[PDB]
Each structure stands twice: as C-alpha cells, then as structure tokens.
Amino acid sequence: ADQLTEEQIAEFKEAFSLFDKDGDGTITTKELGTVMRSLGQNPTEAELQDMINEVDADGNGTIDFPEFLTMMARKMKDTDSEEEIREAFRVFDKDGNGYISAAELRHVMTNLGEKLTDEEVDEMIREADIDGDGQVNYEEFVQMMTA
Amino acid sequence: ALSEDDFDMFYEIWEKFDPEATQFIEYSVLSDFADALSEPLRIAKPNQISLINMDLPMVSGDRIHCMDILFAFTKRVLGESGEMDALKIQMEEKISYEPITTTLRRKHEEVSAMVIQRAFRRHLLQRS
Ligand SMILES: [Ca+2]
Ligand SMILES: [Ca+2]
Ligand SMILES: [Ca+2]
Numbered sequence: 274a275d276q277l278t279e280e281q282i283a284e285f286k287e288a289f290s291l292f293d294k295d296g297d298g299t300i301t302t303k304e305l306g307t308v309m310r311s312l313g314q315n316p317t318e319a320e321l322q323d324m325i326n327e328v329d330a331d332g333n334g335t336i337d338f339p340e341f342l343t344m345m346a347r348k349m350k351d352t353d354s355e356e357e358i359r360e361a362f363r364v365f366d367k368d369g370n371g372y373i374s375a376a377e378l379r380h381v382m383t384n385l386g387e388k389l390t391d392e393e394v395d396e397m398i399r400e401a402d403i404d405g406d407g408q409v410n411y412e413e414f415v416q417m418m419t420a
Numbered sequence: 421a422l423s424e425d426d427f428d429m430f431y432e433i434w435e436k437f438d439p440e441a442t443q444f445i446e447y448s449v450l451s452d453f454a455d456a457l458s459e460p461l462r463i464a465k466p467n468q469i470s471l472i473n474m475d476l477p478m479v480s481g482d483r484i485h486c487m488d489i490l491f492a493f494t495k496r497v498l499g500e501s502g503e504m505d506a507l508k509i510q511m512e513e514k515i516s517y518e519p520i521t522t523t524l525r526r527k528h529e530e531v532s533a534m535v536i537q538r539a540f541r542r543h544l545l546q547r548s
C-alpha cells in the first residue's frame with residue numbers, strides 16, 4: 274500500500290533499522306536472529322530462513338525496506354479486514370435490508386474499467402448463495418471474502 | 421444555525437491546508453480537515469464513511485474544490501432546506517475545474533478491486 278503517511282513510513286523505518294545494524298539497507302537472517310536473541314528468543318536457523326523468505330519478494334535471500342513496508346502495510350490491512358468487509362456489504366446493500374441482490378452487485382461492481390454482465394452477476398450470487406434464496410447476506414458474503 | 425463567525429473559521433482553517441490558494445486540497449487530507457474544523461461544521465474522526473457518502477466530486481490528482489466541500493459540509497448541518505438554497509447562492513458568489521470522478525465512484529472501485537483480488541485466490545484454490 275502507498276496509503277502510508279510520512280510519520281508511518283518513518284515509524285516502520287525505526288524498526289527496519291533495529292535489524293539493519295550494518296546499514297547496508299537489507300536484513301539478513303543473521304541480523305534477524307541477532308535482534309531476536311537480544312529480546313530473549315532463540316529461533317532455529319531454518320526458522321530464520323522461512324521468516325526472511327515470507328517477506329523477501331525477489332528471492333535474493335534478504336529483505337530491503339520496500340519489501341518490509343509491503344509486509345507491514347499488509348498487516349495493518351489485516352487488523353481492519355473484519356470491518357473493511359462489513360463496510361463493503363453496506364456499500365452493496367444500499368436498501369439496507371441485509372440482503373445483496375444482483376441489482377446491487379451490478380450497481381457497484383466494475384472490472385476492466387467497465388460494468389459486469391447480468392450473467393456475471395448471476396454466477397457471483399449462485400457461487401455464494403449457500404441457502405439458495407438468490408440473494409447474499411453477511412455470512413455468505415464473509416465466507417466468499419475471508420481466507 | 422450558521423453565521424459569518426463560522427464562515428471565518430472555514431476560510432481560516434482552509435488556508436492551513438491550501439495557503440497557495442489553489443482552491444483545492446487532496447482527497448487524502450479531507451479527513452484531517454473535517455476534524456480541524458470547529459462546531460458546528462466539524463466532522464470529528466472517524467469521518468471517512470461520512471465524507472465518502474457526501475459523494476464529493478474530484479478533479480484529477482484526486483483534488484477537491486473549496487466550494488464542493490463548503491456546500492456538502494453546510495448541507496450536513498442545515499439539511500436540504502430553502503434557507504440553505506438561499507445560503508448556497510450568497511456565499512457561492514464570494515480557474516480550471518473538470519471533475520472526473522466522485523468519492524462514491526472511487527469507493528465502488530476500491531470495493532470492486534477488493535472483491536476481484538479475493539476472488540482470484542478462491543477461484544484457484546477450489547481447483548486442485
Ligand atoms: Ca543489513
Ligand atoms: Ca529481497
Ligand atoms: Ca439489499
């Protein structure tokens with residue numbers, strides 16, 4: 274995300290620096306381990322790899338600050354997901370009746386910079402409509418979003 | 421309900437965010453601004469959904485004109501009245517401006533994207 278204010282970008286830099294003690298601009302598994310051992314945790318050498326791997330985006334075996342930023346912002350959008358989902362239902366459910374119609378999908382959904390077809394919205398419902406009322410309520414909507 | 425005392429504040433609090441008198445502010449500081457306002461016009465945080473739902477028109481660079489804000493902000497306070505229709509005239513008398521989207525149009529895009537991005541994972545992982 275580039276919805277990050279300067280204060281926050283700086284905030285995340287404070288932490289990136291905690292690790293990047295040689296100031297070369299990457300975090301190595303070694304530097305990861307060092308901070309953790311200083312804070313009283315002793316993880317394996319394999320644990321350290323996997324931790325670097327999950328954030329490393331280019332497979333060069335280390336973490337630059339862009340890669341770090343991506344991971345950290347992804348974690349902020351994690352803490353809001355439950356709500357972000359709710360507030361998206363309320364975007365579709367404009368009549369407020371707690372059921373999402375085809376019409377209500379059609380009205381909002383955009384893809385490849387244009388509307389969806391009646392057939393496309395129909396299937397979106399059909400995939401999500403567990404109970405089979407030809408409408409989507411919250412619980413069905415959640416399962417079709419959450420992971 | 422409203423006074424010149426209040427309109428002094430708006431134009432005072434506005435100069436902070438737009439001293440260059442562009443007559444615009446970026447969308448992403450609309451939340452900050454709405455908060456820096458005083459009563460009654462103020463819209464305290466959290467105010468994201470409120471502002472989105474005002475359906476303010478945005479020109480390019482996601483900027484929003486002074487007046488577009490003032491109108492929606494006073495409407496929220498005075499409601500859709502005739503005293504307000506009169507007010508819309510007076511202060512509207514007291515440049516390049518081509519709106520290309522709205523905050524509600526912008527929100528539908530973000531929700532659409534969210535839906536599509538999440539669909540991708542699902543469509544794949546239900547194909548072993
Ligand atoms: Ca380093
Ligand atoms: Ca890397
Ligand atoms: Ca509905």
Ligand SMILES: [Ca+2]
Nearest residue numbers: 402406408409
């Ligand atoms: Ca249903």
